[PDB]
Amino acid sequence: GYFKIYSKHTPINLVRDLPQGFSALEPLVDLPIGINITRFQTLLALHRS
């Protein structure tokens, strides 16, 4: 019944693949809501012009 979101931001210089390093993720927000989440998507910021 709790939705947890953790987040972290890092400066990067490598192009193609994920960087090889270690860095923990801090808690960002907790939400007290009850849903039976099973699938998700993603949203894009298209330039409607």
Partner: protein, 49 residues
């Protein structure tokens, strides 16, 4: 209804609000504030932080 100031007791308009409490298995979120006291130091006391 024909509510009027000249109407006697029992005929005048009365505003009524009924409060009911729901306990779905989702986490409880609504209730009264928790009291607080002062902070004491250097004395063996019991606490509820």
């Amino acid at each position: 209804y024909g509510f009027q100031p000249t109407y006697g007791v029992g005929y005048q308009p009365y505003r009524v609000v009924v409060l009911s409490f729901e306990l779905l298995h989702a986490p409880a979120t609504v209730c009264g504030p928790k009291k607080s006291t002062n902070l004491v130091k250097n004395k063996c006391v019991n606490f509820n932080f």
